[PDB]
Ligand binder design. Structure first.
Ligand SMILES: CN(Cc1cnc2nc(N)nc(N)c2n1)c1ccc(C(=O)N[C@@H](CCC(=O)O)C(=O)O)cc1
Length: 186
């Protein structure tokens, strides 16, 4: 099992969800970025594991579930069984990581990508070790009811002009955004 990563899109007001869905309208090129980052494995022959809460799962259009070319895992304590389309359910990130050390997954998984929401990001950020955050900064305020944790700049480093990520400001649907990458290692 390779690196642990978070990927998130966050508004100026730290918003990441409203009613369990994106606070902003769909951003097609941003979503394509998401697909590329989460799908590309760093080890030939292996797939990445995408971990998400139940609301994130439901927010994905059903025609695109499970996310193709990635192993999908849902984190929930409320769900009794993996939701329709998913084959893995865990109670917590540590439980999910334990699962990747098991036969079914042990030699299938490369990167782990946490893809939302709030509490699973918090879990990942509280986990010791090397962690990269791929953050899309949505450059406007949007009404939100869930939020991304603050990034501890005493611990994380911003990585300017990160390779393979566009450094210039992007725009879709009149909404500007930019890609930033941070990392910690402890
Ligand atoms: C609402 N939601 C969660 C979502 C959306 N954008 C994000 N963007 C970033 N940067 N990070 C996230 N965690 C993120 N999460 C969605 C919605 C749709 C798809 C989706 O259909 N993705 C497909 C299709 C991608 C595409 O058509 O471009 C894929 O293959 O990843 C993913 C996540």
């Amino acid at each position: 099992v390779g690196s642990l990563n978070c990927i998130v899109a966050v508004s100026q007001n730290m918003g990441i969800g409203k009613n369990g869905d994106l606070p902003w309208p769909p951003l097609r090129n941003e979503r394509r970025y998401f697909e590329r980052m989460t799908t590309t494995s760093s080890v030939e022959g292996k797939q990445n594991l995408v971990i998400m809460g139940k609301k994130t799962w439901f927010s994905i259009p059903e025609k695109n579930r499970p996310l193709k070319g990635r192993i999908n895992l849902v984190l929930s304590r409320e769900l009794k069984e993996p939701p329709q389309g998913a084959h893995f359910l865990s109670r917590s990130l540590d439980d999910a990581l334990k699962l990747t050390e098991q036969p079914e997954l042990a030699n299938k998984v490369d990167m782990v990508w946490i893809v939302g929401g709030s509490s699973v990001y918090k879990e990942a950020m509280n986990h010791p070790g090397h962690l990269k955050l791929f953050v899309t900064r949505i450059m406007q305020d949007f009404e939100s009811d869930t939020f991304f944790p603050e990034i501890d700049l005493e611990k994380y480093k911003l990585l300017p002009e990160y390779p393979g990520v566009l450094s210039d400001v992007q725009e879709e649907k009149g909404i500007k955004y930019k890609f930033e990458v941070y990392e910690k290692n402890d």
